[PDB]
A paper describes a structure:
PFV Gag is a 648 polypeptide and the major FV structural protein in the assembled virion. Moreover, in all retroviral subfamilies Gag carries out the same functional roles including assembly, nucleic acid packaging, transport to and budding through the cytoplasmic membrane of the producer cell as well as trafficking through the cytoplasm of the target cell and uncoating. Here we report the crystal structure an amino terminal domain from the Gag of PFV (PFV-Gag-NtD), provide the molecular details of the interaction of this domain with the N-terminal leader sequence from the PFV Envelope (PFV-Env) and demonstrate that the PFV-Gag-NtD is also the target for Trim5α restriction factors. Our data reveal that the FV Gag is unique and structurally unrelated to the Gag protein of other retroviruses.
Bioinformatic analysis of the primary sequence and that of related FVs suggested that the N-terminal 179 residues of PFV-Gag comprised a stable domain (PFV-Gag-NtD). This fragment was expressed in E. coli and subsequently the crystal structure determined by SAD methods and refined at a resolution of 2.4 Å. The final Rwork/Rfree are 17.2% and 23.0% respectively. By comparison, our data reveals the PFV-Gag-NtD to be entirely unrelated comprising a mixed α/β protein with head and stalk domains. The PFV-Gag-NtD dimer interface buries approximately 1700 Å2 of the monomer surface area. The large central coiled-coil formed by helix α6 comprises the majority of this interface, supplemented by residues in helices α4 and α5 and the adjoining loop. The coiled-coil contains three regions of leucine zipper at residues Leu143/147, Leu160/161 and Leu171/175. Additionally, a highly synergistic hydrogen-bonding network centred on residue Glu154 is located between two of the zipper regions. Here, the Glu154 sidechain forms hydrogen bonds with the sidechains of Glu154*, Gln150* and Tyr127* of the opposing monomer. In FVs the proposed CTRS constitutes residues 43 to 60 of the PFV-Gag-NtD where residues Leu40 to Arg50 form the loop that links β1 to β2 and the remainder make up the β2 strand.
Numbering used by the authors:
A (entry chain A): 9 to 179
B (entry chain B): 7 to 179
Write the structure that this text describes.
């Protein structure tokens, strides 16, 4: 649990033409368009803590990291650079292992899908920061991704060959 | 500096099976393409050096071989491809090299469109990652990430080319 600046959060909401007031217990899916890891999208999931067990507003509100990957259907979503989002979510960082991939957290790479299109592997800055088990999980997941990319590359070659043949036959 | 047993007669059968008539010499280094093994039916690479004699140029009753910590290259001169089980007949306890060395020509992430080694490349399997040290994992992941960056770039290029070709077709109805 880290510190939450709710007035910064509201500015972030308004800048994005989101009118809803953030509520206690709400979960938010974050798309971080860039950060310390580089200029590539990553994902994080947080839960607002605005009140205490007695249902009274906190003087110093907080948020917590949720250990589930952000999904394409994730309802409440915010995109922005790490530096901007940290205005609301103090110390915000990437989640463990392949969770940071969001919709690709389980290696499902889909042709034509915007998220698959935007996916980018972990950088060297990221891997220096990982534990052994994180590295295994990330590596396992990127490997699954590569297997689909490879399969897609083969299909592209066959199709490209066929198209070129069709084009000669019709020229 | 670990050395392992070598069955030269078995090596020579391996060679004859492949129409290679040369006899193995002390100090020769061999590039191995393991077509399949305990990691699965995908190709991996390993490099070894024959030890047939002692420091006094006398033939060993028990020849050995050692692993060379360098990646097999496409130009590697003396090459042998076979499944691990077969190659283990000659090289006792043959196993994959450390981290991305096992990719041979791709050990440094150089993924090239149309290149046969690039086309045959396959990422590490879960059987492989479970065995690896942290630093191995890091190196391998860093390498595979460079590969995917090249694959991503290539996918884009296919999609553009595909588009183009389909238009030219369409306009020929």
């Amino acid at each position: 649990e880290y510190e939450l600046d709710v007035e910064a959060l509201v500015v972030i909401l308004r800048d994005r033409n989101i009118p809803r007031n953030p509520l206690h217990g709400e979960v938010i899916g974050l798309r971080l368009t860039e950060g310390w890891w580089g200029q590539i999208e990553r994902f994080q999931m947080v839960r607002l803590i605005l009140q205490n067990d007695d249902n009274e507003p906190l003087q110093r509100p907080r948020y917590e990291v949720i250990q589930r990957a952000v999904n394409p259907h994730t309802m409440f979503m915010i995109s922005g650079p790490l530096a901007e989002l940290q205005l609301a979510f103090q110390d915000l960082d990437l989640p463990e292992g392949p969770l940071r991939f969001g919709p690709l957290a389980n290696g499902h790479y889909v042709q034509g899908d915007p998220y698959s299109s935007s996916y980018r592997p972990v950088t060297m800055a990221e891997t220096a920061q990982m534990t052994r088990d994180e590295l295994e999980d990330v590596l396992n997941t990127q490997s699954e991704i590569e297997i689909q990319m490879i399969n897609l590359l083969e299909l592209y070659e066959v199709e490209t060959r066929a198209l070129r043949r069709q084009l000669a036959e019709r020229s």
